[PDB]
Write a protein that binds this ligand. Structure first.
Ligand SMILES: CCOc1cc(C)c(F)c(C(=O)NNS(=O)(=O)c2ccccc2)c1
Ligand code: NA
Ligand SMILES: [Zn+2]
Length: 268
C-alpha cells in the first residue's frame, strides 16, 4: 500500500504514481509535508507540531531570481542532500519517468516559489545535471498539480533557457516528457520562435534562444514553416503567416515573464 495523498502547505493532493517513500510512510492514508523544509510525516499531530517549530520560511540555497513575489532558489544536491531527496520523492508522485530519488549530489535543483507575508511557497522545480554530456539543460521538471497550467511551467521552461543563454550553449530537456511536458515545450518553442520571426536562419534562431536545432526544426515542421532543399531544412515563412499564427487561441494568456535583469546568476 503506497502513498496516495499528500497534505502540503494548505493543499491536499492526490498522487499520480508510486513514489518510494519508506514502507512505514507509504502504508499511511495521507502523508504530511512541511512546505519549507520538505520533511514528510505520518500524522497530523507531528505535522502540527513541526509547523509551530519549523523556522524555515523558504527553500535553502541561494535565491538567484526575485521579481515581485516570484522567486527561484538554487540548491546543490551535494550541500542539501536530505532536502533534495525529499524533493525527488515529492516529484516522483507526479512524474512517471523520474527514476533517481536518492543520488542527488550530481544535480542542482531550481525551486520556484510564490511569496506572501507567510513565506515562500513552493510551486514546482526542475533539476539539472552539473555535467550533462548529452547537452540537456533540464533533467526533471515538475509543477505541483494545483499550480499546473497557470504559467509557472512556462516560467520554468523559459528560466531553464535563460541559464542556457548565460552558459553560451544550447540545451534540451531530458526525455521522455510527460503528456503535459510535451505540450508545454511545444507551446513555448512555438511562442518564442514565432515571436522572433515576426520581429533569420535556423542556426541563428538557435543562438538567440538556446533551443537546439532539432527542437527548432521539429517545431517549425508542426507550424509547417520549413522547406527542405538538398538535405537542408530551410525556414519558409511570410511575416503575415507568422501573425495569423501568433494571435491564435493558446498565445493569449499573459505569461509570467523571466526578467534577465532580476536574474542574479553566473556560469561556472
Ligand atoms: C507533472 C509535470 O508538471 C508540469 C511540467 C511542465 C513542464 C509544465 F509546463 C507544467 C504546466 O503547468 N504547464 N502549463 S503552463 O505553465 O501554464 C504553460 C503555458 C504555455 C506554454 C507552456 C506552459 C506542468
Ligand atoms: Na488533487
Ligand atoms: Zn519544516
Amino acid at each position: 500500500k503506497y502513498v496516495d495523498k499528500i497534505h502540503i502547505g494548505n493543499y491536499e493532493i492526490d498522487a499520480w504514481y508510486f513514489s518510494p517513500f519508506p514502507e512505514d510512510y507509504g502504508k499511511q492514508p495521507k502523508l504530511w509535508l512541511c512546505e519549507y523544509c520538505l520533511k514528510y510525516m505520518k500524522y497530523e499531530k507531528s505535522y502540527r507540531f513541526h509547523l509551530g517549530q519549523c523556522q524555515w520560511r523558504q527553500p535553502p540555497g541561494k535565491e538567484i531570481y526575485r521579481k515581485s513575489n516570484i522567486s527561484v532558489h538554487e540548491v546543490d544536491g551535494k550541500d542539501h542532500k536530505i532536502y533534495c531527496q525529499n524533493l525527488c520523492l515529492l516529484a516522483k508522485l507526479f512524474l512517471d519517468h523520474k527514476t533517481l530519488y536518492f543520488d542527488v549530489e550530481p544535480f542542482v535543483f531550481y525551486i520556484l516559489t510564490e511569496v506572501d507575508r507567510q513565506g515562500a511557497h513552493i510551486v514546482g522545480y526542475f533539476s539539472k545535471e552539473k555535467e550533462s554530456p548529452d547537452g540537456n539543460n533540464v533533467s526533471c521538471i515538475m509543477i505541483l498539480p494545483p499550480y499546473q497550467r497557470r504559467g509557472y511551467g512556462r516560467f520554468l521552461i523559459a528560466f531553464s533557457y535563460e541559464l542556457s543563454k548565460l552558459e553560451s550553449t544550447v540545451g534540451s530537456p531530458e526525455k521522455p516528457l510527460s503528456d503535459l511536458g510535451k505540450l508545454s515545450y511545444r507551446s513555448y518553442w512555438s511562442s518564442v520562435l514565432l515571436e522572433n520571426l515576426r520581429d533569420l536562419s535556423i542556426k541563428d534562431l538557435s543562438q538567440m534562444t538556446s533551443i537546439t536545432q532539432n527542437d527548432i526544426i521539429s517545431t517549425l515542421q508542426s507550424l509547417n514553416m520549413v522547406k527542405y532543399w538538398k538535405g537542408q531544412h530551410v525556414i519558409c515563412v511570410t511575416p503575415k503567416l507568422v501573425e495569423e499564427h501568433l494571435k491564435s487561441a493558446q498565445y493569449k494568456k499573459p505569461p509570467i515573464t523571466v526578467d534577465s535583469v532580476c536574474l542574479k546568476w553566473a556560469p561556472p
